[PDB]
Write an enzyme that holds these catalytic residues in place. Structure first.
Site, PDB file in Angstrom:
ATOM      1  N   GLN A  23      34.639  30.887  38.973  1.00 40.08           N
ATOM      2  CA  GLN A  23      34.040  29.568  38.966  1.00 40.08           C
ATOM      3  C   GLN A  23      32.656  29.549  39.609  1.00 40.08           C
ATOM      4  OE1 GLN A  23      35.318  26.897  37.344  1.00 40.08           O
ATOM      5  NE2 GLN A  23      33.471  25.766  37.935  1.00 40.08           N
ATOM      6  N   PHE A  24      32.388  30.478  40.519  1.00 42.53           N
ATOM      7  CA  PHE A  24      31.102  30.535  41.178  1.00 42.53           C
ATOM      8  C   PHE A  24      30.262  31.713  40.723  1.00 42.53           C
ATOM      9  CE2 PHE A  24      33.786  28.457  44.522  1.00 42.53           C
ATOM     10  CZ  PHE A  24      33.200  27.215  44.432  1.00 42.53           C
ATOM     11  N   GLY A  25      30.631  32.339  39.608  1.00 42.38           N
ATOM     12  CA  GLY A  25      29.883  33.484  39.119  1.00 42.38           C
ATOM     13  C   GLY A  25      30.504  34.832  39.461  1.00 42.38           C
ATOM     14  N   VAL A  27      31.646  38.386  41.104  1.00 45.06           N
ATOM     15  CA  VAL A  27      32.163  38.899  42.350  1.00 45.06           C
ATOM     16  C   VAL A  27      32.155  40.414  42.250  1.00 45.06           C
ATOM     17  CG1 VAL A  27      34.103  38.847  43.944  1.00 45.06           C
ATOM     18  CG2 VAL A  27      33.627  36.878  42.453  1.00 45.06           C
ATOM     19  N   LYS A  41      31.063  37.560  46.707  1.00 41.87           N
ATOM     20  CA  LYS A  41      30.818  36.531  45.709  1.00 41.87           C
ATOM     21  C   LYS A  41      29.322  36.245  45.686  1.00 41.87           C
ATOM     22  CE  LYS A  41      35.047  33.749  46.618  1.00 41.87           C
ATOM     23  NZ  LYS A  41      35.957  34.508  45.718  1.00 41.87           N
ATOM     24  N   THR A  85      34.111  38.596  51.663  1.00 41.59           N
ATOM     25  CA  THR A  85      35.529  38.480  51.958  1.00 41.59           C
ATOM     26  C   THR A  85      36.212  39.840  51.998  1.00 41.59           C
ATOM     27  OG1 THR A  85      36.458  38.356  49.695  1.00 41.59           O
ATOM     28  CG2 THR A  85      35.532  36.346  50.598  1.00 41.59           C
ATOM     29  N   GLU A  86      37.442  39.800  52.481  1.00 43.25           N
ATOM     30  CA  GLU A  86      38.357  40.900  52.385  1.00 43.25           C
ATOM     31  C   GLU A  86      38.486  41.366  50.938  1.00 43.25           C
ATOM     32  OE1 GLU A  86      42.068  39.869  54.149  1.00 43.25           O
ATOM     33  OE2 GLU A  86      42.999  41.804  53.700  1.00 43.25           O
ATOM     34  N   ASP A 132      44.260  24.714  44.876  1.00 44.43           N
ATOM     35  CA  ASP A 132      44.324  25.416  43.588  1.00 44.43           C
ATOM     36  C   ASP A 132      45.211  26.653  43.706  1.00 44.43           C
ATOM     37  OD1 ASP A 132      43.883  26.183  40.937  1.00 44.43           O
ATOM     38  OD2 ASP A 132      41.708  26.297  41.155  1.00 44.43           O
ATOM     39  N   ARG A 136      46.580  33.244  39.740  1.00 43.92           N
ATOM     40  CA  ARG A 136      45.205  33.691  39.516  1.00 43.92           C
ATOM     41  C   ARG A 136      44.380  33.641  40.801  1.00 43.92           C
ATOM     42  NH1 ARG A 136      45.927  28.856  37.272  1.00 43.92           N
ATOM     43  NH2 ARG A 136      44.977  27.192  38.514  1.00 43.92           N
ATOM     44  N   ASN A 137      44.833  32.853  41.780  1.00 47.14           N
ATOM     45  CA  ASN A 137      44.124  32.736  43.059  1.00 47.14           C
ATOM     46  C   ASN A 137      44.884  33.395  44.196  1.00 47.14           C
ATOM     47  OD1 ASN A 137      41.909  31.342  41.988  1.00 47.14           O
ATOM     48  ND2 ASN A 137      43.094  29.440  41.977  1.00 47.14           N
ATOM     49  N   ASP A 150      40.775  32.116  48.319  1.00 53.59           N
ATOM     50  CA  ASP A 150      39.894  31.030  47.904  1.00 53.59           C
ATOM     51  C   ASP A 150      40.471  29.646  48.184  1.00 53.59           C
ATOM     52  OD1 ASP A 150      37.956  32.879  47.233  1.00 53.59           O
ATOM     53  OD2 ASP A 150      38.546  32.960  45.135  1.00 53.59           O
ATOM     54  N   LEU A 153      38.201  26.096  48.586  1.00 55.70           N
ATOM     55  CA  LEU A 153      36.869  26.185  47.979  1.00 55.70           C
ATOM     56  C   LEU A 153      36.686  25.200  46.827  1.00 55.70           C
ATOM     57  CD1 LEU A 153      35.934  29.971  48.030  1.00 55.70           C
ATOM     58  CD2 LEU A 153      35.279  28.127  49.589  1.00 55.70           C
TER      59      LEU A 153
HETATM   60  C1  X9Y Z   1      40.130  41.171  39.890  1.00 60.17           C
HETATM   61  C2  X9Y Z   1      40.218  42.574  40.385  1.00 60.17           C
HETATM   62  N1  X9Y Z   1      40.616  43.559  39.584  1.00 60.17           N
HETATM   63  N2  X9Y Z   1      40.552  44.705  40.328  1.00 60.17           N
HETATM   64  C3  X9Y Z   1      40.996  45.986  39.746  1.00 60.17           C
HETATM   65  C4  X9Y Z   1      42.473  46.148  39.965  1.00 60.17           C
HETATM   66  C5  X9Y Z   1      40.606  46.054  38.305  1.00 60.17           C
HETATM   67  C6  X9Y Z   1      40.158  44.453  41.600  1.00 60.17           C
HETATM   68  C7  X9Y Z   1      40.025  45.521  42.628  1.00 60.17           C
HETATM   69  C8  X9Y Z   1      39.904  43.094  41.668  1.00 60.17           C
HETATM   70  C9  X9Y Z   1      39.496  42.298  42.803  1.00 60.17           C
HETATM   71  N3  X9Y Z   1      39.011  41.066  42.698  1.00 60.17           N
HETATM   72  C10 X9Y Z   1      38.828  40.660  44.015  1.00 60.17           C
HETATM   73  C11 X9Y Z   1      38.303  39.472  44.535  1.00 60.17           C
HETATM   74  C12 X9Y Z   1      37.924  38.319  43.685  1.00 60.17           C
HETATM   75  C13 X9Y Z   1      38.236  37.025  44.072  1.00 60.17           C
HETATM   76  C14 X9Y Z   1      37.948  35.952  43.245  1.00 60.17           C
HETATM   77  C15 X9Y Z   1      37.388  36.147  41.985  1.00 60.17           C
HETATM   78  C16 X9Y Z   1      37.097  37.463  41.573  1.00 60.17           C
HETATM   79  C17 X9Y Z   1      37.394  38.522  42.418  1.00 60.17           C
HETATM   80  C18 X9Y Z   1      36.497  37.739  40.207  1.00 60.17           C
HETATM   81  C19 X9Y Z   1      37.432  37.413  39.063  1.00 60.17           C
HETATM   82  C20 X9Y Z   1      37.427  35.937  38.704  1.00 60.17           C
HETATM   83  C21 X9Y Z   1      37.962  35.032  39.802  1.00 60.17           C
HETATM   84  C22 X9Y Z   1      37.098  34.970  41.067  1.00 60.17           C
HETATM   85  N4  X9Y Z   1      37.299  33.682  41.738  1.00 60.17           N
HETATM   86  C23 X9Y Z   1      36.435  33.146  42.607  1.00 60.17           C
HETATM   87  O1  X9Y Z   1      35.433  33.734  43.022  1.00 60.17           O
HETATM   88  C24 X9Y Z   1      36.765  31.795  43.080  1.00 60.17           C
HETATM   89  N5  X9Y Z   1      37.564  30.900  42.530  1.00 60.17           N
HETATM   90  C25 X9Y Z   1      37.544  29.797  43.331  1.00 60.17           C
HETATM   91  C26 X9Y Z   1      38.323  28.525  43.071  1.00 60.17           C
HETATM   92  C27 X9Y Z   1      39.819  28.833  43.136  1.00 60.17           C
HETATM   93  C28 X9Y Z   1      37.967  27.990  41.685  1.00 60.17           C
HETATM   94  C29 X9Y Z   1      37.975  27.477  44.128  1.00 60.17           C
HETATM   95  N6  X9Y Z   1      36.779  30.002  44.353  1.00 60.17           N
HETATM   96  O2  X9Y Z   1      36.249  31.309  44.228  1.00 60.17           O
HETATM   97  C30 X9Y Z   1      38.274  39.390  45.921  1.00 60.17           C
HETATM   98  C31 X9Y Z   1      38.712  40.468  46.701  1.00 60.17           C
HETATM   99  N7  X9Y Z   1      39.192  41.615  46.198  1.00 60.17           N
HETATM  100  C32 X9Y Z   1      39.223  41.659  44.869  1.00 60.17           C
HETATM  101  N8  X9Y Z   1      39.675  42.692  44.097  1.00 60.17           N
END
Ligand code: X9Y
Length: 270
Positions: A23-25, A27, A41, A85-86, A132, A136-137, A150, A153
Site C-alpha cells: 500500500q505504501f510502495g 519494500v 519500506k 523494520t524487523e 487490518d 497477508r499482514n 504493520d 498503519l
Molecule cells: C514477502 C516476502 N517474501 N519473501 C520471500 C520468502 C520470497 C520475504 C523474505 C518477504 C518479506 N517481506 C517482508 C516485509 C514486508 C512487509 C510488508 C509488505 C512487504 C514486505 C511487501 C509485499 C507487499 C505488502 C507490504 N505491506 C506494507 O508495506 C504495508 N501494508 C500496510 C497496511 C496493512 C496496508 C497498513 N502497511 O504497510 C517485512 C519484513 N520482512 C519481510 N520479508
C-alpha cells in the site's frame, strides 16, 4: 548529530533484495551497518500521511513483543521516507500457507494462531488496534514463528479505495457487521478479524467467502451467516474461531480469553 531516537541514518543501509510492493510502495531487504537484517519500506510519495505517522512512530517504537514485527526506526530527512523494520525470512503468512509443500500438521497451524494471538493480546493490553489483521499482514521468520506486521498503519493510508468501506481495497472479508454498517472499529473488530485469520490459517490461505464478491459477503454476514469449518480444523478449533464472529461485538471474547482457549486446545490436541 541530527537524528532522534526514532531516526535511522539511511547511509547505514545496504539494499539487497526487493520483497514486493504494498500500500505504501516498494519494500526491500537489506542490512543496517553491514550486519543487521532489516526490511525497508520506501514510502511512495502521496501514499502516506507522513507527519502524523512520524509522530506515531515514537509510540510504535515502544511496542515490543516477540510476536510483533518490530519497528526499528524511520528515515525522514529524505523523500521518499523510509520505515525500517524487523526482517522476516519466510515472508508473508498468506503465501507461506499457500505453499502446499509444507504440509503443516494441525499442531503447527494452532501454534501459528497462538503466535498471532499473543501479539494481539499484547496490543490489546496497550489499547492499540491493528485495524487490518489478516494473513497477508502477518510475516514468518526463518524458524517458522509468525508475527503480526504493520499494526496501526492503516490510519496513515491516503487512498480512498483502501479506507472507504465500499472501496476496492477495503478488507471487507475480515470485517464485522458494525464496521461494514457504521465503520465502528474497536478491539472487537480486531477480534472478528482474528477469527477470520484463524480460518485462513486452517484453510491454508483460501480467500474467505471465496465464491462471493465483497458486496455479497457484506450482505451474507449482515444476515448472520458465517464462514464454516475448514477441513483441517477440529471442532474445538472451529469453536474458537467461530466465537470471534458473534453478531454483538460485546459478546466476542478478548484476546486474553482467546489465548487461554487456544492453550487449552493445544493441551487437549497435542
Ligand atoms: C514477502 C516476502 N517474501 N519473501 C520471500 C520468502 C520470497 C520475504 C523474505 C518477504 C518479506 N517481506 C517482508 C516485509 C514486508 C512487509 C510488508 C509488505 C512487504 C514486505 C511487501 C509485499 C507487499 C505488502 C507490504 N505491506 C506494507 O508495506 C504495508 N501494508 C500496510 C497496511 C496493512 C496496508 C497498513 N502497511 O504497510 C517485512 C519484513 N520482512 C519481510 N520479508
Amino acid at each position: 548529530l541530527g537524528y532522534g531516537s526514532w531516526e535511522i541514518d539511511p547511509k547505514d543501509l545496504t539494499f539487497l533484495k526487493e520483497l514486493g510492493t504494498g500500500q505504501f510502495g516498494v519494500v526491500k531487504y537489506g542490512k543496517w551497518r553491514g550486519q543487521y537484517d532489516v526490511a525497508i519500506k520506501m514510502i511512495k510519495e502521496g501514499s502516506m500521511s507522513e507527519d502524523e505517522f512520524i509522530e506515531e512512530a515514537k509510540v510504535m517504537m515502544n511496542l515490543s513483543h516477540e510476536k510483533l514485527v518490530q519497528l526499528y526506526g524511520v528515515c525522514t530527512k529524505q523523500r521518499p521516507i523510509f520505515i525500517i523494520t524487523e526482517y522476516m525470512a519466510n515472508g508473508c503468512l498468506l503465501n507461506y500457507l499457500r505453499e502446499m509443500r509444507h504440509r503443516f500438521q494441525t499442531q503447527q497451524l494452532l501454534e501459528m494462531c497462538k503466535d498471532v494471538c499473543e501479539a494481539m493480546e499484547y496490543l490489546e493490553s496497550k489499547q492499540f488496534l491493528h485495524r487490518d489483521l489478516a494473513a497477508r499482514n502477518c510475516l514468518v521468520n526463518d524458524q517458522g514463528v509468525v508475527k503480526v506486521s504493520d499494526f496501526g498503519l492503516s490510519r496513515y493510508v491516503l487512498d480512498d479505495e483502501y479506507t472507504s468501506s465500499v472501496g476496492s481495497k477495503f478488507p471487507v472479508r475480515w470485517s464485522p457487521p458494525e464496521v461494514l454498517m457504521y465503520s465502528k472499529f474497536s478491539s472487537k473488530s480486531d477480534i472478528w478479524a482474528f477469527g477470520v485469520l484463524m480460518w485462513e490459517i486452517y484453510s491454508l490461505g483460501k480467500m474467505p467467502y471465496e465464491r462471493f464478491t465483497n458486496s455479497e459477503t457484506a450482505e451474507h454476514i449482515a444476515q448472520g451467516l458465517r464462514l464454516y469449518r475448514p477441513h483441517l480444523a477440529s471442532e474445538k478449533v472451529y469453536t474458537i474461531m467461530y466465537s470471534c464472529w458473534h453478531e454483538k461485538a460485546d459478546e466476542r471474547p478478548t484476546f486474553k480469553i482467546l489465548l487461554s482457549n487456544i492453550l487449552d486446545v493445544m493441551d487437549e490436541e497435542s
